[PDB]
Amino acid sequence: ADKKAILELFQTYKEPLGNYIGAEGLQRLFEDIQVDPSDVVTLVLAWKLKASSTCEFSEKEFVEGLANLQVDSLEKLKRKLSSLRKEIEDPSKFRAFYQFVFQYSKEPSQRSLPAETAMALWDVLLRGRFSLLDSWLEFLKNNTHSISRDTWNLLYDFSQLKDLSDYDAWPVLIDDFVKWLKHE
Asked: In this structure, are 94 and 72 located in the same domain?
């Protein structure tokens, strides 16, 4: 990939400080390639770029990431996002990507993800992979604390479960959800 071309893309979208693309630049970049900011592929791109700050790419992340994706134009980036959507149909990639989203989406100083942020992301990530999603979101109306890393991670394992009926290891929020489903 032409690093010169990648660096010119960076120049186009970088923030005034010069060393990252932030929420302003990302919104313009996604507009230019006809991608909705809410689309899951924006998170898959962040995952492949090893992004360390929410809704940003540092200059290193962007330039080395596009290079690793063999992308050096906007049109090639747009097409690569279509390839990325297909890539996460692999279940081990989806698990890895799902776990990354927790880390990416919280503030570095915090250990947990705000309830509201977790729900919005679960709606984007798990719709169509988690039959009980709507019930989970409804249950959360009365469980509004921040979501821990273990709870985030194991909700995916819960979603992938006879192990169902044999539910027994699990974080308290998930155990409380199983009890809630029994109306007890």
From this structure: no
Helix (H) or strand (E) holding 41: helix 40-48
Residue 21 · residue 29 · CB < 8 Å: yes
Inter-CA distances, 1 with 64, 71, 94, 159, Å: 10, 6, 26, 39
How buried is residue 64: exposed, middle or buried, by Cβ count under 10 Å (0-12/13-18/19+)?
Answer: middle
The CATH number assigned to the domain holding 133 equals: 1.10.238.200
- Please report, for residues 44, 97, 122, 155, 158, the alpha-carbon distance to residue 129 in angstroms, rounded to integers and kept in the order given: 16, 14, 10, 12, 11
Q: Are residues 17 and 67 in the same domain?
A: yes
**Cα-to-chain-centroid distance, residue 62:** 17
The alpha carbon of 114 is separated from its chain's Cα centroid by a whole number of angstroms, namely: 14
Structure-solving method:
X-ray
